[PDB]
Structure 1
Amino acid sequence: GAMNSSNYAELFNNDIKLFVDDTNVYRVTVHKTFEGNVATKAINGCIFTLNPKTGHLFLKIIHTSVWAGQKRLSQLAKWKTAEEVSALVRSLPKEEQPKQIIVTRKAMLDPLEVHMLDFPNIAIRPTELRLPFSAAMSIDKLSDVVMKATEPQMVLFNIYDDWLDRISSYTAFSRLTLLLRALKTNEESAKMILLSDPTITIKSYHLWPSFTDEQWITIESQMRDLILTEYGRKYNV
């Protein structure tokens, strides 16, 4: 069925699974026209497809040309997402195909179920977790590859860098969701925290800085403080 806090360790078991988030597929800027009406301009987007056990991220870049001449784009975006996830599954060897795909938004269930009818044994599930994957475009190297794309493209990343050499996938997922929640709540301050110390750098082959174990504890504390600080600013607490 649906995925929640009761069955949370299921994410880190040995059954291959993917999260799919479609919140950055169809992206627009809204502006005034010369006549004073309002129009949208699409910008490149991405599908965020993540294995939470291994950290492997299949980032399908959605180039603005896919919307040309199409109507009802917010509806089309869900079906394009499901089309691309289905194509990804079919591209993987059988032993790498997921046994479950967890969508972060319930509106993706029917499009994905329909595109995956050929795979009756892959479960398509919603979740009651509120996951901050929309903030993926706050990760500088991911935003850069999306914005520079001139055509459709798939780029593979490990969203955990090398963390699994030192921590479990449960802890790595918790660190990722804390970082992304902080970037979603106050992007400027979160990036300040992550980069304030110029002696800690991001390796060329990594997304996040090369913090020691003790430095990650400090960073994580500062991110929790940031989230709490913004919560107090929001609700006047």
Structure 2
Amino acid sequence: GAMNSSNYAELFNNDIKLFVDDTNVYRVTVHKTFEGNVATKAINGCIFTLNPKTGHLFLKIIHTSVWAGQKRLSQLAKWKTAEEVSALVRSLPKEEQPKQIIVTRKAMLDPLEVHMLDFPNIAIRPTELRLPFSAAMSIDKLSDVVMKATEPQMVLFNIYDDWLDRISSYTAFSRLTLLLRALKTNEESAKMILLSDPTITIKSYHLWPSFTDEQWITIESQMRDLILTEYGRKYNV
């Protein structure tokens, strides 16, 4: 059934599972036309498919050409997501295929279930968690590879960098969701926190800065302050 606060440690057991987030698949800019009407222009998007135990991120870039000549694009986007996730699963060796796929939005359940009929033993699950994976395009290297794509492309990243050498996958996921929640509530401030100190760099093969353990505690504190504030600045408290 649904994934929620009660069954949170299930994410870090030894049954392979993937989160799928479709919120950045179909992306547009809304603009005025010369006649004063409104139109959309699509920009490149991505499927965010994440193994929360290992940090393995399968980033399928959705090039704007996939929408050419198509109607009802927000509906098509869900089915295209399910088509690409199903293709990913089929591409993996049997022993790497997931036992469960957790979709971050309930509207992905039927598209994914239909595309995975060949895999009756893979459970398709919703979640009651409000996960911040939409903010993945606030990670500069992810945004960069999506916007530069000239064709459909899959890019492999570890979203935890090397953190698992020092912390557990529960702690890594909590850090990730904190960073992404911060980036989603106030991107400019979050990014200031992460880069304010020029002596801490991002390794070429990493997504986030090379913080020491002590510096991650300070960073994480600064992100929680941000989220509470914005929650005040928002609701005035």
TM-score by length of 1: 1.00
Quote the Cα distance in structure 2 between the aligned partners of 1:189 and 1:62. Answer: 29
- How far off is 1:188 after superposition? 0.2
1:57-112: per-residue Cα shift (whole Å, max 9, x none)? 00000000000000000000000000000000000000000000000000000000
- How far off is 1:3 after superposition? 0.5
1:126-178: per-residue Cα shift (whole Å, max 9, x none)? 00000000000000000000000000000000000000000000000000000
Quote the Cα distance in structure 2 between the aligned partners of 1:204 and 1:14. Answer: 30
Quote the Cα distance in structure 2 between the aligned partners of 1:228 and 1:112. Answer: 35
Counterpart in the other structure of 2:203: 203
Quote the Cα distance in structure 1 between the aligned partners of 2:151 and 2:60. Answer: 11
Task: Determine helix, strand or coil for the equivalent of 1:160.
Answer: coil
Quote the Cα distance in structure 2 between the aligned partners of 1:165 and 1:51. Answer: 17
Task: Determine helix, strand or coil for the equivalent of 2:7.
Answer: coil
- How far off is 1:215 after superposition? 0.1
- 1:43 partnered with 2:43: yes
Quote the Cα distance in structure 2 between the aligned partners of 1:193 and 1:66. Answer: 37
Quote the Cα distance in structure 1 between the aligned partners of 2:39 and 2:46. Answer: 22
- How far off is 1:42 after superposition? 0.1
- How far off is 1:225 after superposition? 0.3
Task: Determine helix, strand or coil for the equivalent of 1:179.
Answer: helix
1:180-202: per-residue Cα shift (whole Å, max 9, x none)? 00000000000000000000000
Quote the Cα distance in structure 2 between the aligned partners of 1:193 and 1:219. Answer: 7
Task: Determine helix, strand or coil for the equivalent of 1:130.
Answer: coil
Task: Determine helix, strand or coil for the equivalent of 1:98.
Answer: coil
Counterpart in the other structure of 1:135: 135
Quote the Cα distance in structure 1 between the aligned partners of 2:68 and 2:27. Answer: 14
Quote the Cα distance in structure 1 between the aligned partners of 2:187 and 2:151. Answer: 28
Aligned identity (percent) is 100
1:1-51: per-residue Cα shift (whole Å, max 9, x none)? 110011000000000000000000000000000000000000000000000
Task: Determine helix, strand or coil for the equivalent of 1:19.
Answer: strand
- Give the unaligned 5+ runs of structure 1: none
Q: Write out the 4+ residue segments of structure 1 that deviate beyond 2 Å after TM superposition.
A: none
Q: How many residues align?
A: 237
Quote the Cα distance in structure 1 between the aligned partners of 2:236 and 2:130. Answer: 23
Map 1:1-237 onto structure 2 (within 5 A): 1-237=1-237
Quote the Cα distance in structure 2 between the aligned partners of 1:122 and 1:49. Answer: 15
- How far off is 1:226 after superposition? 0.4
Quote the Cα distance in structure 2 between the aligned partners of 1:218 and 1:12. Answer: 25
TM-score by length of 2: 1.00
Quote the Cα distance in structure 2 between the aligned partners of 1:32 and 1:66. Answer: 23
- Give the unaligned 5+ runs of structure 2: none
